Amino acid sequence: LAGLDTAIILIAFIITAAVLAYVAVNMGLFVTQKAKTTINKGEETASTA
Amino acid sequence: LAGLDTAIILIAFIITAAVLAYVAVNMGLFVTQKAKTTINKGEETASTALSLSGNVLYAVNYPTNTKSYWMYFTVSPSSGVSSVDLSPSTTAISFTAA
Amino acid sequence: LAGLDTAIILIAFIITAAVLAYVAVNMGLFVTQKAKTTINKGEETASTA
Amino acid sequence: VMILFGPGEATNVFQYETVTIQITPNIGSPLTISQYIYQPDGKVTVIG
């Protein structure tokens, strides 16, 4: 009996976590590149005159 | 005898678990996208700004100095990082002389 | 069976996280305003003589 | 950015006073501008 309903919920919870993982990594890659670009623009702003 | 009543309960418990699975995955997809949107809005909020990028000019009925005409100044997005929405329906400009 | 006990714990863990969220945002708003006030008082202190 | 004064605010010149302007767009931090204005010295005067 219980060796099946539990397995289905496990499948669903794994997929749910994998979806957060997918989004978090993508958005980390995005934001850290925005930070890189900003740091460069800050140095350009301080240097150029 | 028992090879039937047990099977019915199994069917019901599977459907019950499948219903939670359905809801949990849908709501995970939803909330993680709200998080994505929020992270973007946070970066936009930290990046977007205006700098004062000229002197502030003030005009009066000189030399008599009884009346005030206009002020002029110049602005630009800070450090060239990102664009700024300046539509007058959304933006406010306040003025105080305390 | 498992499609219920798990749901209850999920409800509780959401509420638990929402409570931390509530406190963290409120206290961030508070402390950042204390910082704003301090920065102003620092500039007043350096300027006034 | 140009501010034109109407008959209310125009009524006498800013002297020995602080003036503050703030621009607040819908996203990002606002820009706050503050000047202590001494007497104006010409047709246009540089205050900040």
**Residues of C in Cβ contact (< 8 Å) with B19:** 3
Q: Which of D43, A28, A4 is nearest to B14 (CA)?
A: A4
Helix residue ranges, H only, C1-49: 2-47
Hey, are the CB atoms on D29 and B91 less than 8 Å from each other?
A: no
Q: Is the dihedral of CA C40, B51, B78, B84 positive or negative?
A: positive
Choose the mutation target among C6, C9, C14 for the interface with A, i.e. most A CBs under 10 Å.
C6
List chains adjacent to chain C, taking adjacency as at least 3 C-beta pairs closer than 8 Å.
Answer: A, B
DSSP symbols for B13-72: HHHHHHHHHHHHHHHHHHHHHHHHHHHHHHHHHHH--EEE-S--EEEESTTT-S-EEEEE
- Say which of A1, A19, A26 has its CB closest to residue B9: A1
Q: Which of B9, B16, B32 sits opposite A19 (nearest CB)?
A: B32
Q: Which residues, in sequence order, are CB contacts of B11 under 8 Å at separation 6+?
A: none
For residue B25, give Cα distances in angstroms to B14, C10, C17, D43: 16, 13, 19, 69
As a whole number of angstroms, the distance between CA C48 and CA C45 comes to 6
Q: Output the CA angle B19-A21-B28, nearest 5 degrees.
A: 30
Given phi > 0 = left and psi -120 to 50 = alpha, else beta, which region is D16? left
Chain B contact set for A33 (CB, 8 A): none
Query: Chain A window 7-26: which residues touch B at a Cβ cutoff of 8 Å?
Result: 8-9, 11-13, 15-17, 19-20, 22-24, 26
Token pair belonging to C3:
């499609």
Nearby residues of B47 by Cβ (< 8 Å), 6 or more positions away: A34, A38, B81, B82, D28
Q: Is A33 on the interface with C (CB under 8 A)?
A: no
Asked if the C-beta of B80 comes within 8 angstroms of chain A's C-beta atoms, the answer is: yes
Cited resolution, angstroms: 2.0
The amino acid occupying position D48 is G
